[PDB]
């Protein structure tokens, strides 16, 4: 019995419940072991055969590509990333009481009991763009331990529903719409480090990572526009970096708001002149908001 | 009683032949290593 990605399945387990992300578009994974190795050249005997031992599982990266789904289940990714939640609203807390990131657990399932299980994991990145294409959400995860296993927890009601219909992006400031959009791209992060725990007590045992601590969070965005001016002497659309701009970005079904932001600009003399805005919140800014709305 | 038994079958296995050049040709624009016999005639 072989195995096939085209009929693989992914299940996320947390809080003693399980989430079936049915609408997976892609995923990629590796697994590896670390080894210690020495060749011990010695003038008595210039040994040619190395001496080596396997010690530890490498921390696997995981990468996922997911389509937006009506029934919104993927909002739990932001919940696990560490946004606070208010119904469908998510907020960054201006300062955070966490030290450890939210640990959770993953099954990869296939026919013939041919299953794999990743025991301790955390989200490191969520990242997407509204670039004139069906918005696909990337996720970066790390996991500290894996094993193969014969079985998995069933999950059947918490299934990611049908994909939401396409709609075009809008950008605005104080209800001014912004002319000549080209793209918007967003990323959110939870930078972390594993605490190295290996000890001489672990000798002749295989070792794993077990705990990590949160270094940082980031929220940031990029916008691409065509260069435009209202009249030659105008000042509002100049190059110079504005600051304390309130900024709002939405589709039909998703909304993001920065109450105050700092804008860098870069200009490119491509065949049509292009401008990139780099966006970041200001230190005094209020909580950035995210909302989701289901299509009827 | 236990043993392990082996065979060796080396011999004057093959006469290794080898061939080498005896002399070399070198070229310059001029010979730089000749000296005067005629010097002795000049001094005489």
């Amino acid at each position: 019995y072989y195995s096939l990605m085209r009929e693989s399945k992914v299940i996320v387990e947390y809080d003693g419940r399980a989430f079936h992300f049915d609408a997976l578009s892609n995923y990629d994974v590796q697994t590896s072991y670390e080894e210690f190795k020495t060749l011990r050249r010695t003038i008595h005997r210039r040994t040619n055969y190395a001496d080596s031992v396997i010690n530890a599982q490498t921390p696997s990266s995981i990468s996922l590509a997911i389509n937006f789904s009506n029934t919104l289940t993927e909002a739990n990714f932001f919940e696990w990333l560490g946004f606070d939640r208010k119904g469908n609203t998510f907020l960054l807390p201006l300062y955070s009481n966490n030290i450890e990131p939210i640990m959770f657990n993953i099954y990869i399932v296939n026919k013939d009991n041919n299953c794999v299980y990743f025991e301790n994991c955390y989200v490191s990145t969520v990242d997407f763009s509204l670039d004139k294409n069906i918005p696909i959400l990337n996720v970066g995860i790390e996991s500290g331990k894996f094993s193969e296993v014969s079985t998995y927890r069933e999950a059947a009601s918490i299934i990611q529903g049908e994909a939401m219909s396409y709609s075009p992006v809008i950008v605005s400031t104080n209800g001014n719409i912004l002319p000549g959009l080209i793209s918007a791209s967003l990323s959110f992060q939870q930078q972390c480090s594993w605490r190295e725990d290996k000890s001489v007590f672990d000798i002749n045992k295989i070792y794993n990572n077990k705990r990590a601590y949160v270094n940082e969070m980031n929220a940031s965005a990029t916008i691409s526009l065509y260069y435009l001016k209202r009249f030659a002497g105008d000042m509002v659309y100049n190059i110079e970096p504005e600051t304390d701009v309130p900024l709002n970005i939405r589709n039909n079904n998703i909304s993001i708001d920065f109450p105050l932001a700092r804008i860098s600009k870069r200009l490119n003399f491509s065949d049509v002149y292009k401008v990139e805005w780099d966006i970041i919140p200001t230190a005094s800014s209020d909580p950035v908001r995210i909302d989701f709305f289901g299509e009827i | 009683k236990i043993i392990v038994q082996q065979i060796l079958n080396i011999d004057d296995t093959t006469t290794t032949a080898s061939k080498y050049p005896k002399y070399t040709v070198v070229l310059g624009n001029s010979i730089s290593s000749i000296t005067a016999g005629e010097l002795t005639a000049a001094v005489e």
């Binding site: - | 043993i3 392990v4 038994q5 082996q6 065979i7 060796l8 079958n9 011999d11």
Partner: protein, 137 residues
């Protein structure tokens, strides 16, 4: 080391090969070895044109123990024997390096004739054999 050993002979030249047997014990390091006493052992072999049990014979070795205490034995063929092979080996003279030429298969037995009237046999070597053509008398 396996049983497999190829052989190359020289056309129109007598051929001879020597061996000695030993016991080994690596329980002493570096590994000990001692010549095996060959008193009472005896050898046989043949060269035949194919592994097929119907295949024709081409030649039979002469063989002799040469020193029982050094455990040494020898095998040979005369030029008359080698000539007989030279007449009958294959003629697939290689287009690029023509001297090597296939002749057949061989197997060498020894019989441990010994006191007690037991006998047992085991095959010491087995392989392919080639002629190299002989331009000079």
């Amino acid at each position: 080391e396996n049983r497999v050993i190829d052989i190359v002979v020289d056309e129109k030249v007598p051929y001879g090969l020597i061996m000695q047997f030993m016991d080994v014990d690596d329980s002493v390091y570096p590994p000990s070895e001692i010549p095996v006493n060959l008193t009472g052992y005896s050898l046989r072999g043949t060269i035949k044109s194919s592994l097929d049990e119907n295949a024709e014979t081409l030649a039979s070795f002469t063989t002799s123990i040469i020193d029982a205490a050094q455990g040494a034995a020898a095998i040979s063929l005369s030029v008359a024997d080698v000539t007989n092979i030279g007449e009958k080996a294959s003629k697939e003279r290689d287009k690029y390096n023509p001297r090597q030429r296939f002749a057949g298969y061989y197997d060498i037995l020894m019989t441990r004739d010994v006191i007690g009237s037991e006998v047992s046999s085991f095959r010491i070597m087995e392989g392919k054999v080639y002629i190299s053509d002989g331009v000079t008398q």
